[PDB]
Amino acid sequence: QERPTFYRQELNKTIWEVPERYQNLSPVGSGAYGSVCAAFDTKTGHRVAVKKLSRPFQSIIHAKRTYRELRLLKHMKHENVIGLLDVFTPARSLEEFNDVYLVTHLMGADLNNIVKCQKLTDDHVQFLIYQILRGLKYIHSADIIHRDLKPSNLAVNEDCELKILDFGLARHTDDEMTGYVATRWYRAPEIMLNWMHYNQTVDIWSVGCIMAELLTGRTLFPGTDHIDQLKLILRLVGTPGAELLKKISSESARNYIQSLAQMPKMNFANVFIGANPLAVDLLEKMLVLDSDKRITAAQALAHAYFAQYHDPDDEPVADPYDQSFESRDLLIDEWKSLTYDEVISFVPPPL
């Protein structure tokens, strides 16, 4: 293994310097802290997506996050999760190391694009939610939570295959959080304001939201702010008891909810008109306020809505992930050096 030959061009207003294996680069939109180009890879013969990070080491927080993202992508080997075909830098030494490029298989679109242009049949929804859940079982088994499941974060292709991306990258103390508007719509009530008490089933709430939207074409709870969001949610699931309501509300929001009459539980079969009774039933197990009674990814996969796909011996869990780095405090150049190590130690898929 010697250094490949690289070539340069300008895409999205920077110089992209990539191995000559990647041809026909085409900008196909932003990624998390980066931008993405589609390409053909002469080496595997696949169409791929290449993400170049935007100023990966511009602060300590950014550098760590660059490290976190690389470590996550390297760990994930699962058909319904984005993984790495390649990671490269044009740098020949740590002393010149500035840029990180990540490569995975090309997916044609995201579920935002699909929901906004096309009606989905109950069969589509079955296979799509199944893949989300299959992927999520695997992520959750490595003690990672996605935290931001929404349609734009679910990549799809022409054969209705799906991969989860942008898992576990953001934290709620991050500034200029992009995507925050859409993220609210899909977020579990218990973490809408603080994160002092939650579990991995925050992600299953988001799945419930996405599923409803794939079935109907419409965003289930498109709130304008924390009070509005809560009101929209309670209008469907019903106003809970006083102890639970306190766990999911600010004092202000709680006061707004209580200035209105108690809302009863709606029967989901009278909301989602025309739906598969089994689709309705699973939604009822996903969109529940009590997170200790919300269904897990593993349990959801055995739900009868997924009878045509479910298979316990073909729904794998992950190798154990070392998140000890998360507790560290390092300077830009130290996170950089760690990220460099990870770039250099990468071993590609066999193909």
Partner: peptide, 18 residues
């Protein structure tokens, strides 16, 4: 009320936006 796109009646493909 949120009627489904395609009412349920007792290989898959998707079209890309472009």
């Amino acid at each position: 009320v949120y009627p489904v796109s395609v009412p349920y009646s007792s290989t898959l493909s998707l079209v890309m936006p472009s």
